């Protein structure tokens, strides 16, 4: 609700995301018949207001209950990402660690930016990773830019699904 990104507000019926009748197939919302193969990307309809989304079951719009926002091996505040960026063999695994283990998108993006500038913007992997950092920071167009620039380098199924 609190994030609006679709250009068209009331687009033609048939060009936006936002069969058997409910007399045969069970349903979950006003429409949207029950599906096979729940995946954690399923939205299956969307609420209208924050109140409706709160005052409904927590798992009526997602495969998991909704959330408001979507010793230690190495302390992230101690290492100078400007020095691990020089060594790509270390930088790649370190970024994967920061991003997928610790979930620190800002430090991950710092490392990925220093790494991409070290590679003179010629490796699609760092572009895809920066695009992922953006995409889960909220910046979609700034991520679509990196995904397009990565598709220009080398076509991969990964970048295609990311742009999707």
């Amino acid at each position: 609700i609190l994030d609006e990104n679709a250009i068209a507000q009331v687009p033609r019926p048939g060009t936006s995301l936002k069969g058997p009748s409910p007399a045969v197939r069970p349903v979950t919302q006003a429409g949207r018949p029950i599906t096979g193969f729940l995946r954690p990307s399923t939205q299956s309809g969307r609420p209208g207001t924050i109140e409706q989304a709160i005052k409904t079951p927590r798992t009526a719009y997602t495969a998991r209950p909704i959330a408001s926002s979507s010793g230690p091996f190495i302390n992230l505040s101690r290492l100078n990402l400007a020095k691990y960026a020089q060594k790509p063999k270390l930088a790649k695994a370190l970024f994967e660690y920061i991003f997928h283990h610790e979930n620190d998108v800002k430090t991950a993006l710092d490392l990925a930016a220093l790494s991409t500038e070290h590679s003179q913007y010629k490796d699609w992997w760092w572009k895809v990773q920066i695009g992922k950092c953006y995409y889960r920071l909220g910046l979609y167009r700034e991520a679509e830019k990196q995904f397009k620039s990565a598709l220009k380098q080398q076509e991969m199924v990964d970048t295609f699904l990311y742009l999707a």
Binding site: L2, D3, I50, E51, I54, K55, S68, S69, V105, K106, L109, D110, A113, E117, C133, L137, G138, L139, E142
Partner: protein
Amino acid sequence: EYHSVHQKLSADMADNSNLIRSLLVQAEDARLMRDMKTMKNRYKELYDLNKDLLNGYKIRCNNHTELLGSLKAVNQAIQRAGHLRVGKPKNQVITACRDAIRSNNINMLFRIMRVG
């Protein structure tokens, strides 16, 4: 460095905007159950985040206007180099400088602006 600073500031402001939307939802929740201590705490946190984000906006805008000044300086310099030569050398020098800046070959840029 202007590019990098703007990138870092935009990242931080995206983080804080996501925080603020989460706090808006949480405050609406606390208000729907008339829990006023937690609602007032969400509103305090929102006030503080707005103050910090406004400081971040000021500094970003400032760096961004400086970045626009720098880009205009670069483009006007390429144009001043091209404008010094009449005819077919003009667009030759223009495209040469554009290619020498897209590749960050500054020395070649100045070489083509000097004699080329």
